[PDB]
Design a protein around this nucleic acid. Structure first.
Ligand code: CL
Ligand code: CL
Ligand code: CL
Ligand code: MG
Ligand code: MG
Ligand code: RB
Ligand code: RB
Ligand code: RB
Ligand code: RB
Ligand code: RB
Ligand code: RB
Length: 136
RNA sequence: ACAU
DNA sequence: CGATGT
């Protein structure tokens, strides 16, 4: 119903899907950019949305913050819940980097604990997520 | 259908 | 119009 303003919002951005993938996290209240991943030459939207949430988890844990995370990715929310990124992207030489980061993200999920709520950003009611890359 |  | 995913 209402936006939890005391929160972190994340989102992927891409050039092509599959294509060049990046992501970032912002303070929901102010839009301040809190982290940004350097672009990855080939990945999918869902892999980047997944990496963005996991990075958010690590970021908040390191800072002893109990803020929730907003994501507008139904897929990535489920993947993080499952601790398993069910991407269809081919594993080959040119996708090695994104797949390494996804594999390492799952590994982190499987070796650490967190209570961070991971919440659906309700775009239909609230407009676009504040971490969005005005590209779509 | 939904995330879009 | 094309894509990745449930
Ligand atoms: Cl990452
Ligand atoms: Cl919450
Ligand atoms: Cl969801
Ligand atoms: Mg998104
Ligand atoms: Mg977006
Ligand atoms: Rb900590
Ligand atoms: Rb966008
Ligand atoms: Rb957009
Ligand atoms: Rb669509
Ligand atoms: Rb969206
Ligand atoms: Rb579809």
């Amino acid at each position: 119903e209402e936006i939890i303003w005391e929160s972190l919002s994340v989102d992927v951005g891409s050039q092509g899907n599959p294509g060049i993938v990046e992501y970032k996290g912002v303070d929901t209240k102010t839009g301040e950019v809190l982290f940004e991943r350097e672009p990855i030459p080939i990945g999918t939207n869902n892999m980047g949305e997944f990496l963005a949430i996991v990075h958010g988890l690590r970021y908040l844990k390191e800072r002893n913050s109990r803020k929730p995370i907003y994501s507008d990715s139904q897929t990535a929310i489920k993947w993080v819940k499952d601790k398993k990124a069910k991407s269809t992207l081919v594993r080959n030489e040119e996708t090695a980097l994104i797949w390494k980061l996804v594999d390492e993200a799952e590994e982190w999920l499987n070796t650490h604990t967190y209570e961070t709520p991971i919440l659906k950003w309700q775009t239909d009611k609230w407009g676009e997520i504040k971490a969005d890359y005005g590209r779509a």
